[PDB]
Amino acid sequence: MSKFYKIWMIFDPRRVFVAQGVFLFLLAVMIHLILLSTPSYNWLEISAAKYNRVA
Amino acid sequence: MSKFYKIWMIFDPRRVFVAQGVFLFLLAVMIHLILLSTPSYNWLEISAAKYNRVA
Amino acid sequence: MSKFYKIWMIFDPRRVFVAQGVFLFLLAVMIHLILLSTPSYNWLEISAAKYNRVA
Amino acid sequence: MSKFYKIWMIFDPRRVFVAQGVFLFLLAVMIHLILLSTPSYNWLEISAAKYNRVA
Amino acid sequence: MSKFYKIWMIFDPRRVFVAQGVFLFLLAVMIHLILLSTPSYNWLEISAAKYNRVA
Amino acid sequence: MSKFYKIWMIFDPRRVFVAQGVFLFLLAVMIHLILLSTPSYNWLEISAAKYNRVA
Amino acid sequence: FYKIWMIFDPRRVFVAQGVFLFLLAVMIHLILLSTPSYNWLEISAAKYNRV
Amino acid sequence: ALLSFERKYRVPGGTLVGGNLFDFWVGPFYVGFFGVATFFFAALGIILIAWSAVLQGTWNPQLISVYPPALEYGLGGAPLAKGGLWQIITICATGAFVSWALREVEICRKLGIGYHIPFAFAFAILAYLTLVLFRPVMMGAWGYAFPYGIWTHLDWVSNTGYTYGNFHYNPAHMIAISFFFTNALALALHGALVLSAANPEKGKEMRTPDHEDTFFRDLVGYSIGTLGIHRLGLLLSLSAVFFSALCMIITGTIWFDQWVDWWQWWVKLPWWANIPGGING
Amino acid sequence: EVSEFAFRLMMAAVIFVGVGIMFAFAGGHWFVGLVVGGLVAAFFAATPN
Amino acid sequence: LGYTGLTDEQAQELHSVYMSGLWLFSAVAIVAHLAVYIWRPWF
Amino acid sequence: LGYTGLTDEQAQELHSVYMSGLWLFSAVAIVAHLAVYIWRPWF
Amino acid sequence: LGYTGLTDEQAQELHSVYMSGLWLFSAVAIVAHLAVYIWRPWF
Amino acid sequence: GYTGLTDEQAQELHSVYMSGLWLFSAVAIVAHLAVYIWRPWF
Amino acid sequence: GYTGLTDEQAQELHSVYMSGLWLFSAVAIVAHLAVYIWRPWF
Amino acid sequence: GYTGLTDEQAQELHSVYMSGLWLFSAVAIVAHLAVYIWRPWF
Amino acid sequence: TDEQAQELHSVYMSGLWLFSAVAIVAHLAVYIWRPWF
Amino acid sequence: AEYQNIFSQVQVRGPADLGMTEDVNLANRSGVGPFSTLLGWFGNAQLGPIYLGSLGVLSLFSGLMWFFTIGIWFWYQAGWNPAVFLRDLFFFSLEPPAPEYGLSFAAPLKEGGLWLIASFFMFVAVWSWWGRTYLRAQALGMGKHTAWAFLSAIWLWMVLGFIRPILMGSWSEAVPYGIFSHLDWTNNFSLVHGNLFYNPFHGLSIAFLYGSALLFAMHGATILAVSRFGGERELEQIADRGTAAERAALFWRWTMGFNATMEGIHRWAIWMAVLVTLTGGIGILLSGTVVDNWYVWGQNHGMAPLN
Ligand code: BCL
Ligand code: BCL
Ligand SMILES: CC[C@H]1c2cc3[nH]c4c(c3C)C(=O)[C@H](C(=O)OC)c4c3nc(cc4[nH]c(cc(n2)[C@@H]1C)c(C(C)=O)c4C)[C@@H](C)[C@@H]3CCC(=O)OC/C=C(\C)CCC[C@H](C)CCC[C@H](C)CCCC(C)C
Ligand SMILES: CC[C@H]1c2cc3[nH]c4c(c3C)C(=O)[C@H](C(=O)OC)c4c3nc(cc4[nH]c(cc(n2)[C@@H]1C)c(C(C)=O)c4C)[C@@H](C)[C@@H]3CCC(=O)OC/C=C(\C)CCC[C@H](C)CCC[C@H](C)CCCC(C)C
Numbered sequence A, B, C, D, E, F: 001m002s003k004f005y006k007i008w009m010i011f012d013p014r015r016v017f018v019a020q021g022v023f024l025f026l027l028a029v030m031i032h033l034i035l036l037s038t039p040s041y042n043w044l045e046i047s048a049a050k051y052n053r054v055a
Numbered sequence G: 001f002y003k004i005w006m007i008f009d010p011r012r013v014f015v016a017q018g019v020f021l022f023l024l025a026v027m028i029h030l031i032l033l034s035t036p037s038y039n040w041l042e043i044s045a046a047k048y049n050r051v
Numbered sequence H: 001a002l003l004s005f006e007r008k009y010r011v012p013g014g015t016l017v018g019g020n021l022f023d024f025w026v027g028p029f030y031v032g033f034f035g036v037a038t039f040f041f042a043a044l045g046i047i048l049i050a051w052s053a054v055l056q057g058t059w060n061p062q063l064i065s066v067y068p069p070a071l072e073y074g075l076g077g078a079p080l081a082k083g084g085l086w087q088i089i090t091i092c093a094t095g096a097f098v099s100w101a102l103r104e105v106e107i108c109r110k111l112g113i114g115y116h117i118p119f120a121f122a123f124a125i126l127a128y129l130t131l132v133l134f135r136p137v138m139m140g141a142w143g144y145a146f147p148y149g150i151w152t153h154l155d156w157v158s159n160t161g162y163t164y165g166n167f168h169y170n171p172a173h174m175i176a177i178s179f180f181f182t183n184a185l186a187l188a189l190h191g192a193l194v195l196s197a198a199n200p201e202k203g204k205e206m207r208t209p210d211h212e213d214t215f216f217r218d219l220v221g222y223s224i225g226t227l228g229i230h231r232l233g234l235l236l237s238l239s240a241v242f243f244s245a246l247c248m249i250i251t252g253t254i255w256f257d258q259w260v261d262w263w264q265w266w267v268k269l270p271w272w273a274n275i276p277g278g279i280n281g
Numbered sequence I: 001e002v003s004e005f006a007f008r009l010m011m012a013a014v015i016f017v018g019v020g021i022m023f024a025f026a027g028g029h030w031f032v033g034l035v036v037g038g039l040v041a042a043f044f045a046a047t048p049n
Numbered sequence J, K, L: 001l002g003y004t005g006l007t008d009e010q011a012q013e014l015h016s017v018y019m020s021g022l023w024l025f026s027a028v029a030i031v032a033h034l035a036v037y038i039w040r041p042w043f
Numbered sequence M, N, O: 001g002y003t004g005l006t007d008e009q010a011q012e013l014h015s016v017y018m019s020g021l022w023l024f025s026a027v028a029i030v031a032h033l034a035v036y037i038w039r040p041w042f
Numbered sequence P: 001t002d003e004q005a006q007e008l009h010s011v012y013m014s015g016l017w018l019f020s021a022v023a024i025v026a027h028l029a030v031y032i033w034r035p036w037f
Numbered sequence Q: 001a002e003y004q005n006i007f008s009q010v011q012v013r014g015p016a017d018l019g020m021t022e023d024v025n026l027a028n029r030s031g032v033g034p035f036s037t038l039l040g041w042f043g044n045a046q047l048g049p050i051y052l053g054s055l056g057v058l059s060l061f062s063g064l065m066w067f068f069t070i071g072i073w074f075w076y077q078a079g080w081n082p083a084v085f086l087r088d089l090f091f092f093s094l095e096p097p098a099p100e101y102g103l104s105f106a107a108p109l110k111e112g113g114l115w116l117i118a119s120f121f122m123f124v125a126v127w128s129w130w131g132r133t134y135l136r137a138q139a140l141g142m143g144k145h146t147a148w149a150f151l152s153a154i155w156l157w158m159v160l161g162f163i164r165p166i167l168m169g170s171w172s173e174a175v176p177y178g179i180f181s182h183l184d185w186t187n188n189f190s191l192v193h194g195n196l197f198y199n200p201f202h203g204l205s206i207a208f209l210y211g212s213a214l215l216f217a218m219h220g221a222t223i224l225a226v227s228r229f230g231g232e233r234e235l236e237q238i239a240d241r242g243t244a245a246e247r248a249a250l251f252w253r254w255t256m257g258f259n260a261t262m263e264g265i266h267r268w269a270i271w272m273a274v275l276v277t278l279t280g281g282i283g284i285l286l287s288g289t290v291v292d293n294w295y296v297w298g299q300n301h302g303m304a305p306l307n
């Protein structure tokens, strides 16, 4: 738990930083798209009903 | 946190600023197009109904 | 804000003026095309109705 | 604004005059195309009704 | 048990940690997708029923 | 049976250990997929009935 | 027949044997599973009235 | 008559059959054993086409058409006027094309060059034999072959294609098209790049292959190189013809329905077949 | 004489068929065979001695 | 000082001519827009 | 002094004219938006 | 230093201009979100 | 080590990285709380 | 030694790898317990 | 031999591998028993 | 080598025998479990 | 069996190669990319560097916006569902305006407005790539053959998406952006115009398309066959004819009775490929504007039998 820092002696931070950056974005977008496609969790279609904007 | 600026020792800021600019613009364009596709949030249609600009 | 001028110490001025010119052109055409594609804001079809021209 | 001329030490007039000459021509043709495609503004077709040369 | 660490004298940890990262992520993705495919475990579809959120 | 250690003189341990790792994963996953393919051992659908989760 | 380990490199010979013998054994199990009469998983479902 | 450098290469030998019996030239053309064979089959096949025009009763070369036997004849012989001429001309075409490849092998031997050219030509022969021989024999009738006629063989392409709906949906046909289009792209680029170096701006020196590498790296960030481009142009051409032959040998032998219906296997994969929305939901 | 790469390709084409039948049976669809048999065999093919 | 190798005075000469060409072009452009508006308003 | 070879003064010279151009372009755009809003509000 | 060639002094100043851009951009984004929310709440 | 970094550099580097991760994790934890309050998934 | 790792380097590096494995696998067990409390599969 | 391993290295590496095989197979045996208690397949 | 091929052939044969023994058990066991002749 | 020179036996890697300078504005050229050992078996291993500059940025940004505009329409047609997006990926389609809208820009965004927006970004991307292909040659003092060759492909593409829709009077004549939908368009085009096989310029275009596979097979096989004499170094064979060029010439002269040169075979190559899309573009431009039924036109011009 203390020695974890030695991982940066193994991997070039440039590569790791870009790789985790792309990973987090593509994961986050995937989840939001799963939610927008889920009718019980699409916040845009929820608030449309809650405020009777459907008319 | 105070050492975050040492990122510019790792990445050429010309490449980061170019990459960040196109990331932000594509993200913003996608969100606006999502809302225009969303009937309850298409501001161009909302005003059209508010002012009877069709029929 | 007083040191935003240091952008020109890191980016070549021609590349910036070209990249920003290119951007503003494509954006401006896109919005005019979005409005022509919007029945309530197409100024040519609006005036055609307003003056009983063929529309 | 009084130093808008300073651009010519940055950009070559041969490049700029050609690039702008191509741009303005295509913009002009694009607009005449848009209007000729619009029945309310096709000046040849308007004249056909105004002088009853049609039929 | 005492000698399993000699695996690092055989496999270079860079290649191991990349291969392990891919392996573990894709395995987690398999299991969550199997559960989302499973009516008794699709947590979003379960929550929808439990809170009456559909129709 | 004592001389089975001789295998490591002939086959490179890296190129064997990779082959074993891939092999064991494939065999395990194949069996789990076969078990899920039979209702007799699909532990998700056994559980669904047992706990009355779809009714 | 011990000449054969001189005739062909035993690395190639074991790569052949190990994979082929596994794929033969697999093939035998997978055909038996396609039978009604010897599929053990689906016979056991009958004995213990599981399905 | 000779090219000014040609004489030093006109040595004896390299013939596969016939030794020196046919090891001579006729103008520019090398003869050899297979040159005799080639000319015989070529002349016979051409002359039987002209005779088929007499039987058909047209002299317009665009209407001349030699049809294969009807399906009632199976793989047996037909009357000459009613499919039997097509069968002999198919023998002559095969004899001519194969003899021509073998004559190229002899010319390769006499010049000491690699055999890449006759090997590449053998792919075209196999695509021909797929359409006139292997697939008709699989389907059981010479009438599934195409007719020898400038426009009537396009009717065969049309009628064969529309038997399976839109033929664009044959997945091997899609791959063949991708190689055909990519080959034509690469031939345009390769011709242009070599010419742009040998023919620079007026007054400039000839450019080097370093400029050729530089132009494409500047343009697209990669350059396959002088040797890579000729490997690519060969393999793109041969891949196009391999996947063309493959797309037809499966058509009407293992696939019978509308090719568009094949693509439903992806749509109906069970993890997403039922998910609402999209085009297929 | 069969090269190491040749022997690799010769043997990879076996694994392709074998792993393919294994996973087409296990995954219940021939596409699972084709994907897994493709990945495993191509990995084997790419790594000759 | 600069990329093109124009002098600061050559820049001013060329700019003074360029701007005059722009003003002559846009002057005609206004007259055309006003004429079309008088002929057939688009608003 | 930076990557570009421009000095700290050249970078201030060019920035002063860039902002002169930005503020003019955005001022005209602001006027264009206000005219269109008065003509035909989108809110 | 590091991998680029920027120093500690150079990087620590550049970062302050970058963050001045971040907060300014973010502040306008907050105003935009709040204005849209007051106009049309999405929760 | 095959990044060439001294140990001192790797310790320095890790302190910044983890402080970023703690900040990112904190925002995520609040975001899940707000969404769970708004609309529980359990 | 194919990787060039000395015995002390391998005995060090393994200790940190194991520390991460135990941490990760522990968190996984907590997750399994919670989801079992939510919805037992066995 | 093709790998250049000493008799020491070949016997050492084998003894570690065999402890891997035994440990893996021992847990597998237990995993089978755990399921056999629940649902015998004969 | 010729002597190394003697050694390997013995080892491979001893394993090849050891595998055979397990199948000679397993067919008997499955014949007991559900005879197929 | 012998070596055929189709894959390399040994790879050597030197330093990175930065390439010629000439009048290239070297500030606009990137660093060199990584080497690929996989590509090195077939061609060069080095990736990069690449030249950007002004027409580069214009082309890459407009091309990104074209691609992004189609992608978002596909994500919308998928209903934002990442599974449906991958199921129906080849079935999504951004269709042009409906016929009633003619050439007017008044079509709604869902009924063809996004197709015009997408098509505008494609127009700028392709034409700015053409000027980039001209100027990269100019900076190296090379001939403009590559830019004039690319203009022949642009001609067909312009006919398909721009010129013929204008001459037919509606954007509904243009090609939809989609994998199967441009195939459905291609099939439907031939049916509406009465079998495109009987278009003589479609016949010509196919002759040059087959000829391009014929000729590149011949040329690629020829150069590999003489590569044992350094025949792949074609510019030095043009400047200083070696035995490679003579053996290549005598193979074809003895085979078919005539031959090319090392410079002149690349003129056959460029024209064989250029004529594909030149004659193609004419054949499409005539379809519907001049001939609405090519089979009946074929009957009147002695290439199909009369009824
Ligand atoms: C009704 C049918 C019966 C039954 C009837 C039989 C019968 C009858 C027999 C078996 C046999 C076996 N069955 Mg069965 N079987 C049943 C159900 C199962 C189930 C299950 C999920 O239900 C499983 C997992 C098994 C598994 C097994 C294996 C233990 C064994 C075959 C091994 C083999 O050929 O390996 C492959 C063989 C090889 C030589 C290759 C080894 C591996 C290769 C080399 C891959 C790489 C390894 C890696 C690199 C390590 C290298 C080592 C080096 C020395 C370093 N059975 C049911 C209950 N089973 C057979 C047996 O006992 O064989 C001995 C047999 O005859
Ligand atoms: C049922 C279908 C119809 C049919 C309908 C059509 C139609 C319709 C057309 C053709 C056309 C063609 N047909 Mg036909 N065709 C049929 C039967 C055939 C058969 C056959 C064996 O039966 C063959 C071999 C052909 C062959 C051909 C080609 C000769 C020709 C296309 C040339 C070309 O290069 O296009 C491919 C090249 C292009 C489209 C040019 C592209 C250039 C642009 C600039 C590229 C931009 C790239 C973009 C920005 C993406 C960039 C990505 C990068 C990664 C950055 N057809 C039948 C009868 N055919 C075309 C033609 O010319 O007809 C005369 C045409 O329009
Ligand atoms: C495999 C990749 C491509 C390829 C390669 C290729 N072709 C080749 C070569 C190579 C490498 C040669 O070396 C060889 C050659 O010498 O080229 C000049 C050849 C060649 N490719 C030819 C043509 C050709 N290649 C084609 C295609 C292709 N060739 C492929 C796309 C096509 C078509 C339609 O796609 C044609 C028409 C010739 C120029 C030549 C072979 C010449 C030959 O065989 O000569 C001996 C025969 C004669 C002179 C006449 C024979 C007459 C017949 C006996 C009677 C006619 C029968 C025929 C069936 C009638 C058809 C009527 C049509 C209207 C249907
Ligand atoms: C003469 C006829 C043949 C022909 C010729 C031909 N084509 C040509 C040329 C020639 C001579 C060129 O010089 C030119 C070329 O450059 O070739 C390498 C080209 C070309 N032919 C092409 C394609 C092509 N040619 C074809 C056909 C043909 N080309 C004919 C067979 C076909 C088909 C269907 O048959 C296709 C698809 C291209 C490879 C190229 C033209 C490239 C072009 O115009 O591109 C415009 C688009 C872009 C520049 C970018 C698109 C988007 C990318 C994803 C980039 C994104 C970058 C961005 C910064 C990313 C940011 C991401 C953020 C999230 C971070």
Ligand SMILES: COC1=C(OC)C(=O)C(C/C=C(\C)CC/C=C(\C)CC/C=C(\C)CC/C=C(\C)CC/C=C(\C)CC/C=C(\C)CC/C=C(\C)CC/C=C(\C)CC/C=C(\C)CCC=C(C)C)=C(C)C1=O
Binding pocket: H026, H029, H030, H031, H035, H036, H037, H038, H039, H040, H042, Q211, Q214, Q215, Q218, Q219, Q220, Q222, Q223, Q245, Q248, Q249, Q252, Q253, Q255, Q256, Q257, Q258, Q259, Q260, Q261, Q262, Q265, Q268
């Ligand atoms: C790098 O650079 C390279 C070059 O170069 C340096 C090149 O060039 C080329 C080649 C490429 C080009 C030049 C580009 C142009 C070519 C194409 C685009 C491809 C298409 C080509 C064609 C359409 C031409 C095809 C020509 C054919 C098919 C041949 C036509 C001629 C005949 C039918 C006759 C052939 C002659 C034969 C077989 C032998 C004849 C003689 C006998 C049989 C012996 C009998 C005769 C006698 C004994 C005595 C004489 C009697 C006579 C004459 C009559 C009586 C004979 C009887 C038998 C009765 C390439 C690729 C290249 O990579």
Ligand SMILES: CCCCCCCCCCCCCCCC(=O)OC[C@H](CO[C@H]1O[C@H](CS(=O)(=O)O)[C@@H](O)[C@H](O)[C@H]1O)OC(=O)CCCCCCCCCCCCCCC
Binding pocket: H073, H074, H075, H076, H087, H088, H090, H091, H094, H095, H132, H133, H137, H139, H140, H141
């Ligand atoms: C010392 C030597 C002793 C030799 C002893 C005698 C051996 C004779 C047997 C030879 C065995 C192999 C024959 C081929 C296979 C077979 O059984 O076929 C029998 C079928 C008959 O099928 C018939 O029956 C078919 C069904 S079936 O196959 O019977 O099930 C049916 O589909 C078809 O319509 C019908 O016609 O006929 C053929 O397949 C046709 C052979 C064609 C050969 C000449 C081709 C000429 C036409 C133009 C093409 C030219 C190509 C030129 C290439 C260079």
Ligand SMILES: COC(C)(C)CCC/C(C)=C/C=C/C(C)=C/C=C/C(C)=C/C=C/C=C(C)/C=C/C=C(\C)CC/C=C(\C)CCC=C(C)C
Binding pocket: A020, A024, A027, A030, A031, A034, B003, B004, B005, B006, B007, B008, B009, B010, E025, E028, E029, E032, E033, L002, M009, M012, M013, M016, M017, M018, M019, M020, M021, M024
């Ligand atoms: C779609 O999902 C399903 C429905 C299928 C469910 C399953 C999905 C699934 C399997 C999800 C898995 C998610 C995982 C594995 C997430 C992991 C996330 C990680 C690894 C996040 C890490 C974030 C780290 C951050 C934000 C770090 C930032 C660091 C910063 C800002 C500082 C960087 C350091 C420096 C600048 C160094 C300076 C010092 C020197 C010496 C130069």
Ligand SMILES: COC(C)(C)CCC/C(C)=C/C=C/C(C)=C/C=C/C(C)=C/C=C/C=C(C)/C=C/C=C(\C)CC/C=C(\C)CCC=C(C)C
Binding pocket: B025, B028, B029, B032, B033, C024, C030, C031, C034, D004, D005, D007, D020, K017, K018, K019, K020, K021, K022, K025
């Ligand atoms: C689908 O989505 C929608 C389209 C609906 C919404 C998208 C929303 C979105 C993401 C918008 C983004 C907007 C942004 C980021 C806009 C930024 C604008 C800026 C920074 C504009 C700056 C403009 C500056 C100008 C025009 C001028 C500079 C002038 C200078 C430097 C002086 C020198 C120039 C000359 C002397 C001119 C010479 C003459 C010519 C012709 C070049």
Ligand SMILES: COC(C)(C)CCC/C(C)=C/C=C/C(C)=C/C=C/C(C)=C/C=C/C=C(C)/C=C/C=C(\C)CC/C=C(\C)CCC=C(C)C
Binding pocket: A025, A028, A029, A032, A033, A036, B024, B027, B030, B031, B034, C003, C004, C006, C007, C009, C010, K002, L010, L013, L014, L015, L017, L018, L019, L020, L021, L022, L025
């Ligand atoms: C509808 O929603 C979806 C379905 C699409 C889901 C979307 C959910 C999702 C995953 C969203 C993700 C959003 C993310 C990750 C956004 C991140 C935004 C960031 C990182 C923004 C950063 C902005 C920074 C700015 C504006 C900085 C500007 C800096 C400037 C102007 C100055 C630059 C510095 C200098 C000039 C240096 C000068 C000094 C020297 C010494 C040279």
Ligand SMILES: COC(C)(C)CCC/C(C)=C/C=C/C(C)=C/C=C/C(C)=C/C=C/C=C(C)/C=C/C=C(\C)CC/C=C(\C)CCC=C(C)C
Binding pocket: A003, A004, A005, A006, A007, A009, A010, E024, E030, E031, E034, F025, F028, F029, F032, F033, M001, N009, N012, N013, N014, N016, N017, N018, N019, N020, N021, N024
């Ligand atoms: C439906 O059922 C299924 C089909 C899904 C059944 C699937 C059945 C199946 C085959 C499952 C297989 C599961 C397996 C094999 C799982 C294995 C998991 C493992 C081994 C996980 C290991 C994780 C290790 C971790 C998280 C280690 C982290 C290490 C860290 C953080 C330390 C890094 C730093 C250093 C080593 C320091 C470097 C030192 C120096 C000296 C430079």
Ligand SMILES: COC(C)(C)CCC/C(C)=C/C=C/C(C)=C/C=C/C(C)=C/C=C/C=C(C)/C=C/C=C(\C)CC/C=C(\C)CCC=C(C)C
Binding pocket: E003, E004, E005, E006, E007, E008, E009, E010, F020, F027, F030, F031, F034, G022, G025, G026, G029, G030, G033, O009, O012, O013, O016, O017, O018, O019, O020, O021, O024
């Ligand atoms: C009906 O269903 C089916 C079709 C599946 C029926 C069954 C089909 C069938 C034929 C199944 C066959 C199964 C077989 C062949 C299973 C074999 C399993 C094996 C080979 C298991 C072996 C496991 C070995 C392990 C886990 C070894 C681990 C070794 C370790 C951890 C240490 C490695 C050594 C070192 C690190 C030391 C290095 C030393 C030095 C000096 C550097």
Ligand SMILES: COC(C)(C)CCC/C(C)=C/C=C/C(C)=C/C=C/C(C)=C/C=C\C=C(C)\C=C\C=C(/C)CC/C=C(\C)CCC=C(C)C
Binding pocket: D030, Q067, Q068, Q070, Q071, Q072, Q074, Q075, Q116, Q119, Q120, Q122, Q123, Q157, Q158, Q159, Q160, Q161, Q162, Q175, Q176, Q177, Q178, Q179, Q182
């Ligand atoms: C992963 O998700 C992301 C969103 C990140 C990316 C998704 C990327 C994706 C799925 C992209 C899909 C792209 C596809 C399938 C593209 C297909 C393109 C095809 C097959 C095109 C075929 C033919 C196109 C032609 C012939 C187009 C010609 C266009 C011309 C000539 C331009 C003419 C210009 C106009 C009509 C516009 C006139 C307008 C004005 C203002 C004058």
Ligand SMILES: [Fe+3]
Binding pocket: H190, H194, H230, Q219, Q223, Q234
């Ligand atoms: Fe060449």
